[PDB]
Amino acid sequence: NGNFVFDSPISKTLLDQYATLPNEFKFMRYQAVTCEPNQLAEKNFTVRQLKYLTPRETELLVVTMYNEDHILLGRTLKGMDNVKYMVKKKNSSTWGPDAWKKIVCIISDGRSKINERSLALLSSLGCYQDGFAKDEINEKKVAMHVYEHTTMINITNISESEVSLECNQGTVPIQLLFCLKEQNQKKINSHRWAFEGFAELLRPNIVTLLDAGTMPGKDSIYQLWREFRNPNVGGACGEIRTDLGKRFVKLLNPLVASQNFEYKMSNILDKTTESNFGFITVLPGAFSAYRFEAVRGQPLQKYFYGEIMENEGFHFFSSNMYLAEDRILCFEVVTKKNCNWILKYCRSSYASTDVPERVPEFILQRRRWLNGSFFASVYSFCHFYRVWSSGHNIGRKLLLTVEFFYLFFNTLISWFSLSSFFLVFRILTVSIALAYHSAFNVLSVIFLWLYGICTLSTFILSLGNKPKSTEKFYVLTCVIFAVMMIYMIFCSIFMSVKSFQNRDIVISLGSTYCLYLISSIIYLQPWHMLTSFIQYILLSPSYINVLNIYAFCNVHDLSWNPLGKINTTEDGTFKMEVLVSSSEIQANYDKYLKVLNDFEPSYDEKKTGYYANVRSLVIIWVITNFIIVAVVLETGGIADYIAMKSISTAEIPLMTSKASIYFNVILWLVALSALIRFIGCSIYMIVRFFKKV
Amino acid sequence: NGNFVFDSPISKTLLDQYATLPNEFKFMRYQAVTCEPNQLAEKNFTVRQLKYLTPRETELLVVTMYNEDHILLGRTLKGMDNVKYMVKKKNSSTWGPDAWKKIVCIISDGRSKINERSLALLSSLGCYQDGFAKDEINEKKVAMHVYEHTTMINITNISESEVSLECNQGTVPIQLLFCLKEQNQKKINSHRWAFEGFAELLRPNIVTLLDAGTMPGKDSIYQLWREFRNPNVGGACGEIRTDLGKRFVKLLNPLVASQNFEYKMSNILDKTTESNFGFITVLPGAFSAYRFEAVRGQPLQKYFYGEIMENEGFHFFSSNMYLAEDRILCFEVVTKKNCNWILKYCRSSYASTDVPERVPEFILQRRRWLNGSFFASVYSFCHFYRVWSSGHNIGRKLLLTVEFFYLFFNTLISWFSLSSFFLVFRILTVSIALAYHSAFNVLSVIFLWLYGICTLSTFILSLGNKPKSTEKFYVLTCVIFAVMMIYMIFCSIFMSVKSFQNRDIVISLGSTYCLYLISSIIYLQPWHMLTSFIQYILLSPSYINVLNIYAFCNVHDLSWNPLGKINTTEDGTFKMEVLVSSSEIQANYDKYLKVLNDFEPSYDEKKTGYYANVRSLVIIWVITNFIIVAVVLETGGIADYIAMKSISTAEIPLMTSKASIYFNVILWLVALSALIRFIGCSIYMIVRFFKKV
Ligand SMILES: C[C@@H]([C@H](N)C(=O)N[C@H](C(=O)O)[C@H]1O[C@@H](n2ccc(=O)[nH]c2=O)[C@H](O)[C@@H]1O)[C@H](O)c1ccc(O)cn1
Ligand SMILES: C[C@@H]([C@H](N)C(=O)N[C@H](C(=O)O)[C@H]1O[C@@H](n2ccc(=O)[nH]c2=O)[C@H](O)[C@@H]1O)[C@H](O)c1ccc(O)cn1
């Protein structure tokens, strides 16, 4: 039909296990796509599911990959376990002995970057054969290499070294569909291929987004698909668990134990609370599910292209919304016009992913998350009236409004954290010295200077340099801040012990831990509340001061005729035309005489200019935090101003009463959020328990 | 001789004026160079001067150009006036009726960037004809297009619009030699072509470096050549005067009046004082002269290549000396082994250049000068022992040692200026409020906050952004600092008036102006001491705080198979070889099975890493200035520390006595330098007067 397709046989060694035979199993199809992802249908491209005597009707998985090795891809593919569980499911109206026919997509990204040890595994499965890729077809550049087949072998064990494949009477067929882009176009393009391309052909019911390296549990995909029984749910997500290795031998890295605790409390407290209202801020791209009908239309338009209505110039939201990439989908689904979709959190389905283990990789990873969450929250709050233009009933609309206000309260608290941390630190360290005089004077001065030097260097290195160039310094900074936090804990314990012997710093901070602990107990998963709490506490002054500074200082990732030839022989003789005619010489001379007598750059450069002027206006964050510091501590010359006024009608005081008032406000304002999230987690568990009963 | 040369005739219209005839005048020579600049001789390349019956012996001009229009190049070429003066010179042993035969080079830089309205002028002179450039010759890429001729027409007037050429009995011949590089290789390459190339062929006596747009006076080149009568002088330079337009109608821009005053005091005070000792730190590249024998060897090696002795890794001086580009020549000439060359300043020869007129262009220009001077001074001080290994007598060696120590004292004063300015500002503004209470409290706080915000924004914008993107902000910053300086002057005048009615701020600062004025009077050029003093005073808080911050924050200018094809007919049928043999399929499958079973980047990136780690260690300047601020004002928690100590055996004081002591030290330390430079200028003028008498 004007398109290039090919159909090769597989190696007879595969046939040896396959016999232990239809046209689906013995052959593979290589369609080569050259068009745009949004044209597969009208360019006469098909897939094997639409070719049979009765076309197959798909019920359910996109696995994005870039350069992951074969162990990560093996883990994702092994998590085949879900498909096997779903065929062996007996008492069901949707799944049964032939369930695999209703489940189908591995989107690679560029041939140069792909790890050929993973192409090895894809070929072992039988979904790729080298030899017949075609880098252009009839003056049209190929864009996609689509291999398809239907294997019989399953990954059954994964050591640290090898992936074990087998083909028995107990394995189940898998309808693989391997897409190979010839070039890296970033993840958004891959999702573009998955949603605007093959999803329009297959017409699935649910689209589940996995991520190479993420291993769903033995039932997790089934438990996620069960969330969509409710005809209102539009998206869903499950728990993401840090992979702690064999014998939990990766819970030693303090950067991995920190992330384990952080993920675990994010799931227990934040996600259940959000799911009560009906709008989860981010559905993780490593393990999420969308009802296809829910996202078609406005959500995908906003995700892939952006706010289309725009002039030639740049606008804030329209030209910056690309920084909140996969979080636009959630907001546009929940607030869709004339539809009542909601987002649900399923805690019965988990997936264990791999986390960064070195400080530079970790910083670069969180640079994306922090900018995405900040821009997404600003967009959600500045556009929350859309909630009232949607189709929900009035109760749900009120709940969503309350949740949006609570989420903005949280983002504001997080914006003022640079100053909250310093103020708590300096108020506490000066107060202990004023109380006891012994050696806390010198430590107060020393720690002020250490904080100042580390913060100065973090601004300078993040604005100018790159984390890979200077890793020793970032490790040293994290160690310095850990020691500072230890000193803060010692000071609080000392002050409280002496005060008891002779106060609210224990009634508020103790509640936050007791409430954290009780929420973990309610969730029936408390084992992180001791193995990894200390690392989080110690690596927490660095999540406030190093990841935030780097995140805001690197918002946008800026990036600032042949008129002759002479060939001669060994002798060196040749000739060409020479402008011999003196009239033409005079003509050229008069041309230059008259030339003497006749007395914005690229859109890319203009866009880079705009992007770099918006990264430099958000940092100048610093002023609004210093305003708080100056008001409370009376820095900035304000105390001098008050003293001079008193003289006009004197001496400056060491520590004032604004410090006490503020340092109470922060402790109770951080106890309040823990209280709210504990109540939310309790409601979630209780409602789930009644519905299960 | 294996090289491509060509010899075209000129237009007969030129012949019309030339008649009003030898082979030098009627023809032009286009040699095309493809080799390296240091190979012109042994590759059998010549110039017309070596071809005559008796080869010409050159006595004396390289004019670097990039994209200057035809007015600037016209001005440089007009300043032909010097050659005419030198032929009409009667009573001389070197110059006479045929002096032009001893004077010869215009080094363009790339055909793409050259302003074709200047190619118009070069063709009007008769030294370029389009039609026979050859972009490659016998598998060798052309590197240089060398046109040569010997004109008769002279530029006699330059309006704002046109350049007036004429050919009479009164004009004089000029031996032009137009070099056109096919690509931009930066100025260092052009000087490489000028010195290592054509200068080895011509063997001149003096090499004078002009720069397109700079117009030497009617006698300036002759007066510069006269400095080399002394067989010890190795280099020389003249005064550079800002071009103030017709009717001085450019002395209105405050950025141009500032630069006029700055250039004028640099010439009067700095350069005469340096020339007394015998070592001028920078000979400006816009108008300088070097005795060719003086610079051959070590100076040119260090200028063009660098400290050759080096390992694979990077070292500070060896790998950063390229930032001090034309200042290495001076240091290496003066301290040359077994030679007693000195550098001399000639005030009888001037040249009027064009200056930047918008803040972004000005900032980008001074970014080069400040980094160059800082690295050159560090290199000169860290290597000053070389002075004692040279050939000078002991008196000159002692004088050079004293001068080197004085120059390091100056560079240290300039390194601590960021803190000196703030300390003077805050001590003065707080002191006036403590004295009079009226409305100086509020102004003290307001100006502290304005200073803080402008300095924060200058760090952030210079570390992240570019000056062209944000020009409104830099203009606003300069205005803010001008207002601050006005307030500083008001405060000092008010305090002094009240103190006289009831002190050293007038005996020191008044001396600095009286000494500036007296030096200008001695120099017989005082007219800048009123037309442009106010602009310099007001635009001076910005030379300390905006150009220095930008200069140190931008030290180094960082910059971070086809395996198929298918063509078919309209029907779409074709065939190629297919790996049909199943044995080869099994072979490939086993190849991937075994692939599964088998379980630093570019030198440019490493160099960029090193460069960006050295720009980030020099800024972290900030700490050593803040140490001074903290010691004097008792910021940084030191005053709190003292108060807590006093309690351990209380209240903080507003203003202490360290402020008074420091604020005396700065005023007298800035009066001392003015005194030294006044004495130096006086010695220079007096010695020149006796030698002239
Ligand atoms: C981040 C995620 C996982 N560790 C991961 O790395 N995800 C990548 C990503 O987020 O970009 C995926 O993107 C693909 N990719 C990369 C470069 C490219 O150029 N194109 C392209 O497609 C990569 O191969 C990879 O599969 C982690 O588990 C997680 C996420 C959310 C959460 O709440 C908790 N945990
Ligand atoms: C700066 C100088 C003059 N205004 C100027 O602009 N000099 C350029 C420079 O310093 O680079 C020259 O360099 C050439 N150039 C440029 C780009 C390139 O890529 N390659 C290349 O050769 C340009 O054409 C130009 O002639 C000014 O008068 C001055 C200097 C010192 C001083 O004490 C007082 N005043």
Numbering used by the authors:
A (entry chain B), B (entry chain A): 382 to 401, 409 to 448, 450 to 468, 470 to 494, 496 to 893, 912 to 969, 977 to 1015, 1025 to 1045, ...
Quoted passage from the original study:
Chitin is a long-chain polymer of β-(1,4)-linked N-acetylglucosamine (GlcNAc) and is synthesized by chitin synthase in the plasma membrane. In this report, we determined seven cryo-electron microscopy (cryo-EM) structures of S. cerevisiae Chs1 in the apo state and in complex with UDP-GlcNAc, UDP-GlcNAc+GlcNAc, UDP, UDP+GlcNAc, PolyB, and NikkoZ. The overall structure of Chs1 reveals a dimer architecture with a twofold symmetry and is ~100 Å tall and 110 Å wide. Each Chs1 monomer is composed of a large cytosolic soluble region and a transmembrane domain (TMD), with both the N-terminus and C-terminus in the cytosol.
Nikkomycin Z (NikkoZ), another peptidyl nucleoside inhibitor of chitin synthase, has shown significant clinical benefits in mammals against pathogenic fungi. The nucleoside moieties of PolyB and NikkoZ are the same 5-aminohexuronic acid N-glycosidically bound to uracil. In contrast, the peptidyl moieties of PolyB contain carbamoylpolyoxamic acid, and NikkoZ contains hydroxypyridylhomothreonine. We determined the structures of Chs1-PolyB and the Chs1-NikkoZ complex at 3.6-Å and 2.4-Å resolution, respectively. Comparison between Chs1 maps in the apo and inhibitor-bound states revealed clearly elongated extra densities corresponding to PolyB and NikkoZ in the active site, consistent with their function as substrate competitive inhibitors. The nucleoside moieties of PolyB and NikkoZ are stabilized by T453, M454, Y455, and K578 at the top of the active site, which are the same residues interacting with the nucleoside group of UDP-GlcNAc. In contrast, unlike the flexible GlcNAc moiety of UDP-GlcNAc extending away from the active site, the peptidyl moieties of PolyB and NikkoZ extend toward the chitin transport channel and form extensive interactions with E457, D602, A677, and W760. Besides, the switch loop of Chs1 is open in our Chs1-PolyB and Chs1-NikkoZ structures. Notably, end part of the peptidyl moieties of PolyB and NikkoZ occupy the GlcNAc acceptor binding site, and thus block the chitin transport channel. Therefore, our structures suggest that the peptidyl nucleoside inhibitors inhibit chitin synthases using a unique mechanism: the nucleoside moiety competes with UDP binding, and the peptidyl moiety induces the switch loop open and blocks the gate of chitin transport channel.
